[PDB]
């Protein structure tokens, strides 16, 4: 069947702004996760849990009576898809149970792993997500072990479709870099957003890059796949070493007799793939990555054995029953236990990037620190288990149940808490005229609000105005911010909050955070007006104000919009055309298309764009809030080309007389040429559509300033 | 950008059953289009419409000063991509303003047509939908030149994203028949569902089958394709010679001048295309089709001679500027008038499918009969007229405004009028009672209701248990439906209602038709009773019976399920797997993905398939309505293969004991198969869901039992 992307290959497609609607949806309209999880007895599903750890199922027998390897390992890699540049990947959602994650390469066998969670999932049903399952049941496997874990939150409610990820170009599984499709350029530079060195990799090549096993040049790959996904070189040897105490690797035979990956299995099977002709198929013949490793001499017990091991043997180069390249200590008693046989032993056995913790220098320092004071180890592996598996959590204010954390981390972005009361409706009003009255523009109301609320991205759910991270490094000094524009608005924010909270009694007083959106808010209502509209926008007080102290700068650097439609902003230039990085940034935001429109047609006319830019202004009557936007661009009165000096700049000129009207960019004019985006314009540019054009504004605008508001869910 | 389509090209693809969510669609949840239609004054559109007709504007000029050919042709493509097979495409939608039909080549310079629209739709808004504004405007070009319509109905919303619908395989515009994605084979058999004889054409190849100018076998294609559009050979004639009546093709110089269609056109073209470098572009100029062709001496005005024409000459193959086939008048003067130019004229011409009209054996005598009795050619031109735009929009309750004919048409599966009081909930409850009084079981009364209500179509709002056409030709008879096990309910039904109508008094009676619904509705709660379930089954009367006359049978037959998973039948093999024809019937009804799941989990053990079949009957209690067949599908517990016998038919046995549990088909096992559907199950199969699954089931059930309920709506 010839579909629309196959005739026109390079549209842009909307169908991303529409995933996750009510129809796909099997719970109802009104359930919510939170609630239920709030009455799971966590203990009971823990100790059903830790039960099922040593209680083997025929069909995917337990690695020396424990599965608690394999579930390490499955938790690792539901939250190892994470890469800062986006937020994309992570645990949040339980998409390892959908494609293409399901199928991935490096997934192999995880599938079983699901599979022997279904009897407890189905005990519990709604009460718990498998998104929480997964990282629960990790959790459950290191306290089985005797690994003392940081905390658990529950909270991550379960999705019920793929979501859209750029995981990169290549048509290849596990393709080589330097092909047609190379995610690498230059001296080994991983393009953006991508954080891992192959197409279904979580990180590195276990062997060494592309297949070559050398520690070293591993230890590259492996520093720049962990960056980006947050974690420094502390947290990367914690976490690798951490894992690899526990558990096996599966490479008991040739390759070639792995079968077809979930995806493409037939239907007899179920859900499960990789079937695998070697002998039995499973158990003692397991075959997955193709390494045959196991790191310590109690692979079902916390020690501090793999370090012993990587520091007390001397390494040579061998192959694996299945051909992969790994190390053996050939001057080494055979002290590691067998899978299955307990009258085998085997010789201590590393990966290629196992041994980079010891070959790369920097690395070396930490792994012997760790070596030495093995409490170390254990306390930064469970700091760097927590932040992986929550990273992508949100605000702690969706953190829910018995176990979480009380120590407050500065990578969560934390928002002191409230201990006043906050202002009512009576007094919002009043700081509304006050900022009107300073002489502030509905322009810089709006820009400098829109800028705060608008870093929130709904990937990781970092990001939003609370905090008043703007007034902060490095917010404050982003590009698309306006530096000298944003420091004058917040001074005179600044003095308005200063003398309202200083005439309070009782304690009463509002954040800057709060009053920036209020500001905003009381902007919008001004631009109305001036349309001659008196509209009350919604506001919800509640937000507090975050410190310099409490916020780390170098993780903050990903939140920097280098492209917002929104307000007609590119940064440099890209290779992708700035209309599909509109809809990325429409995505990030959770807004549907039609909200995207909508949004985007009143900035215009309010002023919000960058350096006052007249792009897209298509009104008479700047910092009123009309339809103008949608009427004047869908004029066939007007005719549209490229600029001779810029092909991404357009002139519309009066078709008869060939008189200059407007200028637009890409952003602005594929709202008149995408045939679904110009069949919403239509609906706000028609006769009857002034009051939806402002109700629908407002809704959207109000959306935006409460995306991270968390404690009012 | 690599997708899961590229991974998995033949993965089953359920996003066809989440199109149109509230997510995509502009007006709010609670936006009535026909309450807002109600309102429009549709005089004063047609005033404006008709002003249009001759208001030329540059960038488009109108031929002869009038639009009006332009305008029928616009009409008529929106509704003629219609096919009876599945009842999709056609006028309905407004499908014509997106992706793919927009761009097709047989609508080209159609863009410009619809930007001539613009102003008027922006004046009247959502008061009038693009969908009925194409139809009316077609109306209203008739009527400006001189033409009486048989009449005119509103009431098509306008929709927001294509629809998914299969126009064929092959990977080239206009493909000749033979290629490797050929839609013909054997002796030019063209493949259902499609209607059209190349890929981007309305029906067939105005110079001949594949380009070959020979008006006799044209006319085997159009009397095909116009046959699976829904029309006979007197409505077909009727269509053609009055649609060519009017205006004139558009072929000045060789295609190769016309540039990209709308969807590949660059951005500044503001969602129009196929822009011309020949000579002035268009106009005089234009070029639409290629060939070169005016029908009448009045191209603007109605007239006979059209006839007078294709009869009183001799023809003549020649080329048209483009290099096209068509034919001119042998020795004629020339008699027909410029568009442009008042001091050309030019020789009477014709298409190869004009001639076919002439030298088809059956259609030369309606031809003749209509050239003379042109009266008889006016009615049966206005009634088809009327047919070819009304054919999708359902039930005449439906239709809106002030112009809807009275006159009933058989094509319209006509509905009697309800002259008498209709049963309350006393007499719901003393029917149903009777009806499990009388000895029928759960299966027959779930299976009838079934086989009755699930004939409905959303693609042309066709078919569903109104008019108990179940009880006659063809329906009664059809396979899937069990024409002896269907004969015997129907007669004790039919004791029942005789019985209970007799007994009323005040002209108070049941129709058949809600009889049959109400005792399906009993046979739910008897389920769910035998489950120990207390539950109520919503039932809404006013079905009224249809006549044996009332139903053309022909038409009937494309409404004959020859797949239905929901009862597990399959009529024959078939290329497309079972669950691909599933997913597609689903779509048909109306379903979400979770609606599917439930309906058919449930159905499943009420004992709805075809024969008895056992075939995912996964319960120990068939007729008691349970979530069984989720739980027991997604028992870890039973392994399946498929049987060496029949690879789509597959066994469940215990994988400890070997012993036989279950059989299953494709259908069935999909849904422990695919990873979307499988969550689905999880939900429905988890130790909680009991309640949600019988909820969720009577709500889909009653759904499906008011699908063609539009008197309600
Ligand atoms: C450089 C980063 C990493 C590399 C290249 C890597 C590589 C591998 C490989 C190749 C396997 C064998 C899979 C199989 O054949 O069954 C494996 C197993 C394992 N990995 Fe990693 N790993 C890395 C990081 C981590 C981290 C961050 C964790 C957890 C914190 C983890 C925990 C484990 C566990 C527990 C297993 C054993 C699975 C079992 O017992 O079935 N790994 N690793
Ligand atoms: C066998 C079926 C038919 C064929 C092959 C056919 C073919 C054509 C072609 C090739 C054109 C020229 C398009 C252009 O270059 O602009 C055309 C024009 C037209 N057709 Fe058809 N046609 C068919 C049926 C119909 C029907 C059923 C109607 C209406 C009831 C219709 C009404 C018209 C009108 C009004 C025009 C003139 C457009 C104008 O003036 O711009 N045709 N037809
Ligand atoms: C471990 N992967
Ligand atoms: C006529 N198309
Ligand atoms: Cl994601
Ligand atoms: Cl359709
Ligand atoms: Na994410
Ligand atoms: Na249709």
Redesign the interface.
């Not at 629309?4 to 026109?8: F, H």
């Given at each position: 069947?010839?579909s629309?992307?196959?005739?026109?290959p390079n549209?842009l497609d909307?169908?991303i702004?529409?995933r996750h609607?009510?129809?796909?949806?099997?719970?109802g309209k009104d359930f919510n996760y939170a609630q239920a999880f709030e009455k799971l007895d966590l203990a009971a599903v823990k100790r059903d849990l830790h039960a099922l750890m040593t209680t083997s199922?025929?069909?995917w027998p337990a690695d020396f009576g424990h599965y608690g390897g394999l579930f390490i390992r499955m938790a690792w890699h539901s939250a190892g898809t994470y890469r800062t540049a986006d937020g994309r990947g992570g645990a949040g959602e339980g998409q390892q149970?959908?494609?293409?994650l399901?199928?991935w390469p490096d997934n192999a066998n995880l599938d079983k792993a699901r599979?022997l969670l279904?009897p407890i999932?189905?005990?519990?049903?709604?009460?718990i997500s498998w998104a929480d399952l997964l990282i629960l049941t990790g959790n459950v496997a290191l306290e089985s072990m005797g690994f003392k874990t940081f905390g658990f939150a529950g909270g991550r409610a379960?999705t019920?479709?793929?979501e859209?990820v750029?995981?990169?170009?290549?048509?290849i599984w596990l393709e080589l870099s330097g092909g047609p499709n190379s995610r690498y350029s230059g001296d080994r530079q991983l393009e953006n957003p991508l954080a891992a060195v192959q197409?279904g990799l979580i990180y590195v090549n276990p062997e060494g890059p592309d297949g070559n096993p050398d520690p070293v040049a591993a230890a590259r790959d492996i520093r720049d796949t962990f960056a980006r996904m947050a974690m420094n070189d502390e947290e990367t040897v914690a976490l690798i070493a951490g894992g690899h105490t526990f558990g096996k690797t599966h490479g008991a035979g040739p390759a070639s007799n792995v079968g077809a990956e979930?995806?493409?299995a037939?239907?007899?099977?179920?859900?499960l793939g990789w079937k695998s002709a070697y002998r039995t198929g499973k158990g003692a013949d397991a075959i997955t990555s193709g390494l045959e490793v196991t790191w310590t001499t109690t692979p079902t017990q916390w020690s501090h054995n793999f370090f012993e091991n990587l520091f007390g043997y001397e390494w040579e180069l061998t192959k694996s029953p299945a051909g992969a390249h790994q190390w053996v200590a050939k001057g080494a008693d055979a002290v590691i236990p067998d899978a299955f046989d307990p009258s085998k032993k085997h010789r201590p056995t590393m990966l290629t990037t196992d041994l980079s913790l010891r070959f790369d220098p920097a690395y070396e320092k930490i792994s012997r620190r760790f070596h030495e004071n093995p409490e170390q180890f254990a306390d930064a592996f469970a700091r760097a288990w927590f932040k992986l598996t929550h990273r992508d959590m949100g605000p702690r204010a969706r953190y829910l149940g018995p176990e979480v954390p009380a120590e407050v981390l500065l990578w969560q972005d934390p928002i002191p808490a409230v201990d006043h009361p906050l202002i009512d409706a009576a007094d919002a009003a009043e700081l509304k005229a006050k900022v009107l009255a300073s002489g502030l523009t509905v322009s810089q109301l709006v820009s400098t609000a829109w800028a705060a609320a608008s870093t929130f991205r709904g990937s990781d759910k970092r990001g939003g105005a609370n905090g008043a991270r703007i007034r902060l490094a490095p917010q404050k000094d982003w590009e698309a911010n306006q530096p000298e524009q944003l420091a004058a608005v917040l001074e005179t924010l600044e003095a308005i909050r200063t003398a309202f909270n200083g005439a309070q009694r009782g304690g009463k007083q509002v954040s800057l955070a709060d009053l920036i959106v209020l500001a905003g808010c009381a902007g919008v209502e001004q631009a109305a007006k001036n349309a001659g509209h008196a509209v009350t926008v919604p506001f919800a007080p509640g937000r507090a104000d975050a410190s310099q102290e409490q916020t780390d700068v170098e993780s903050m650097a990903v939140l920097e919009p280098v492209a917002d439609g929104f307000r007609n902003y590119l940064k440099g230039k890209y290779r992708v055309p700035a209309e599909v990085l509109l809809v990325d940034k429409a995505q990030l935001l959770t807004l549907?298309?039609?909200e995207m429109?909508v949004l985007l047609g009143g900035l215009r006319v309010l002023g919000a764009n960058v350096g006052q830019s007249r792009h897209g202004v298509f009104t008479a009557r700047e910092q009123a809030l009309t339809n103008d936007f949608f009427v004047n661009l869908?004029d066939?009165g007007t005719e549209?080309?490229?600029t001779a000096a810029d092909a991404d700049v357009?002139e519309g000129r009066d078709?008869?007389t060939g008189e200059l009207k407007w200028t637009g960019t890409?952003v602005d004019?594929?709202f008149?040429?995408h045939?679904?985006l110009?069949?919403?314009a239509?609906?706000?540019?028609?006769?009857?559509?002034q009051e939806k054009f402002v109700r629908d504004f407002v809704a959207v605008w109000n959306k935006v300033m409460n995306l991270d508001r968390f404690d009012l869910a």
């Open positions: 069947g010839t629309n992307r196959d005739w026109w549209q909307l169908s702004l529409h609607s009510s129809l796909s949806d099997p719970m199922q025929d069909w149970r959908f494609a293409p399901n199928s599979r279904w999932k189905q005990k519990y049903g709604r009460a379960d019920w479709e793929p859209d750029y995981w990169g170009s290549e048509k197409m979930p995806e493409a037939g239907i007899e099977a179920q859900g549907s298309a039609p429109t869908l066939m549209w080309k490229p357009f078709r008869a890409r004019l594929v008149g040429s045939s679904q110009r069949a919403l239509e609906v706000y540019g028609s006769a009857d559509a």
